[PDB]
């Protein structure tokens, strides 16, 4: 508009309905749960020490569950003796007995096969080169989107996303 | 809007979600409605690519002189069939002549490689009415594809005429010659009115410019002669273009299709002249994968020097 005052009126947004029920007589404390994301300083009652005396009832009481997304189950199918076979095979033929071959043979998660055994250095350096030779076939447009995926993941863990 | 009454973004694909099987009215537009309102006109059979070779007369016994144009068929093959489930309409792609492999690009070399056909000079599509018009890929069409007396339409690019004036381009009369005219004999005169007509030149105004070198269709041209050895199909009347230019010949849309017996005899002659058109095509497709896989891996040199 012409003046800043005229712009403020056209861009006005009224306050929340809750604030507009002003008491005619006296003061009243009202419950106005906001439609926003709560911060991390609102400790849930489960994380409060038993000593702490502020564990009140819900403020609702002073006046099914959502769909599962990730419910893992841990299994221990590899006995101590089977951990020695994994260390023998991996060190004997690391190209035939990969972590996928050993994972399927012993019914384990691929990460575990690496927790108990590690391939020889020569084989490890061979894997990094294959992925290094793969990172040279990327053009400038794909190499920039692959770096952004690695920065968005580190930022996510720094509280920046 | 940009084109017509539709405000839909061009990048949105909602066609599959508005189906007549769900109880919706059959739209008046779209590929389905476009084929339904052209079913009668659409030619039953494919056409052929021919080369205009010159004009002459067909002298007939007892006294008939019929001016006619000669069109030659030069190795007309069937290259591809366009189905409705894959392209949205029925058509046959026809090839003409040949081209040197060096001049044909790699994108097109691998296109003919997957069919068993030598590279062609030109390619053109001919719309057919239904799935009965699709022919085996790799079959040659001879002048006998037509019969004497069959009316056809010839589509060819007209002779180029460069920047034309108003007289030659739009048939303007011009102005006077000697009764006081001043430097304005072949000029177009007025280009509009005045402030009451928009104070502008009106879109679509006829003006000088380029003329010619565009497609023109001559309909209802009988077939006077059909000679296989020469490879020619003599049609009555004139045809657009210069000698040595490629033209498209197909059945007339404004005339009834040829009898059922003829449409079947011509299809029965392709199964005799080319008894194995599918075995030679499947073999070429099987080879394309081997070569396409050798190019990917990088071992194409081995196959070239195999024998």
């Amino acid at each position: 508009q012409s003046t800043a005052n005229r712009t403020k009126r056209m861009l006005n947004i009224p306050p929340h309905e809750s604030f507009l029920n002003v008491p005619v007589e006296g003061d009243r404390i009202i419950f106005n749960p906001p439609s926003s994301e709560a911060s991390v300083y609102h400790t849930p009652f489960k994380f409060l020490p038993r000593s702490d005396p502020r564990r009140r009832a819900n403020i609702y009481k002073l006046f099914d569950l959502p769909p599962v997304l990730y419910n893992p189950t841990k299994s221990y199918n590899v006995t101590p003796e089977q951990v020695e076979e994994i260390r023998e095979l991996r060190a004997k033929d690391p190209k035939k007995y990969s972590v996928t071959y050993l994972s399927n043979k012993y019914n384990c998660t691929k990460v575990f096969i690496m927790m108990c055994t590690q391939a020889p250095r020569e084989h490890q350096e061979q894997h990094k080169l294959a992925r290094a030779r793969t990172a040279e076939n990327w053009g400038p447009r794909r190499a920039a989107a692959k770096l952004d995926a690695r920065r968005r993941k580190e930022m996510l863990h720094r509280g920046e996303i | 809007v940009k084109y017509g009454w539709s405000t839909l973004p061009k990048r949105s694909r909602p066609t599959r979600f508005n189906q007549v099987t769900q109880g919706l009215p059959a739209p008046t537009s779209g590929p389905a409605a476009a084929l339904k309102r052209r079913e009668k006109t659409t030619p039953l059979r494919t056409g052929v690519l021919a080369v205009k070779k010159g004009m002459t007369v067909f002298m007939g016994r007892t006294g008939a002189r019929i001016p006619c144009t000669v069109l030659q068929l030069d190795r007309v093959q069937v290259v591809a069939n366009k189905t409705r489930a894959k392209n949205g309409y029925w058509a046959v792609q026809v090839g003409l002549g040949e081209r040197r492999a060096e001049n044909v690009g790699a994108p097109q070399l691998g296109y003919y490689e997957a069919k068993g056909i030598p590279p062609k000079q030109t390619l053109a599509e001919f719309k057919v009415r239904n799935q009965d018009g699709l022919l085996p890929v790799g079959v040659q069409l001879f002048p006998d594809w037509f019969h004497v007396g069959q009316v056809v339409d010839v589509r060819g690019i007209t002779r180029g005429m460069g920047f034309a004036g108003g007289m030659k381009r739009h048939g303007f009369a011009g102005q006077e010659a000697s009764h006081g005219n001043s430097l304005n004999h072949r000029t177009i005169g007025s280009v509009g009115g005045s402030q009451g007509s928009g104070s502008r030149v009106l879109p679509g105004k006829k003006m000088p410019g380029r003329m010619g070198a565009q497609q023109h269709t001559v309909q209802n041209l009988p077939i006077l002669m059909v000679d296989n050895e020469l490879g020619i199909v003599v049609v009555k009347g004139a045809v657009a273009g210069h000698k040595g230019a490629v033209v498209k010949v197909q059945d007339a849309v404004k005339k009834a299709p040829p009898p059922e017996e003829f449409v079947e005899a011509t299809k029965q002659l392709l199964n005799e002249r080319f008894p194995d058109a599918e075995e030679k095509l499947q073999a070429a497709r099987k080879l394309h994968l081997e070569l396409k896989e050798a190019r990917r891996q990088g071992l194409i040199d081995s196959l070239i020097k195999n024998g």
């Binding site: - | 068993g116 006998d144 020469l230 017996e261 040199d301």
Partner: protein, 89 residues
């Protein structure tokens, strides 16, 4: 069943290496003529003009106009007296 073909090679001028090659198909070297067709149709409205089929996949005469003028003259003048009555003799 696999028709005859030749290989076309696209090489590099910088490294002298094969960039990509294709199998170019060629028409039968020795043109193969086929027996007369057995498709005989009887209909008044049309006749199949399959009198004399040429060899498959072969270029026809480039200039059929002078060859066509000798077909109509031989049909409009089976003897030659008319063609000779106006010759340059």
């Amino acid at each position: 069943a696999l028709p005859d073909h030749n290989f076309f090679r696209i090489a590099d001028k910088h490294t002298k290496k094969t960039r990509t090659a294709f199998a170019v198909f060629t028409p039968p070297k020795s043109p193969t003529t086929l027996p007369p067709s057995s498709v005989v149709t009887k209909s008044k409205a049309f006749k199949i003009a399959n009198s004399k089929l040429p060899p498959l996949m072969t270029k026809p005469p480039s200039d059929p106009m002078p060859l066509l003028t000798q077909q109509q003259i031989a049909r409009m003048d089976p003897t030659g007296a008319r063609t000779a009555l106006f010759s340059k003799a």
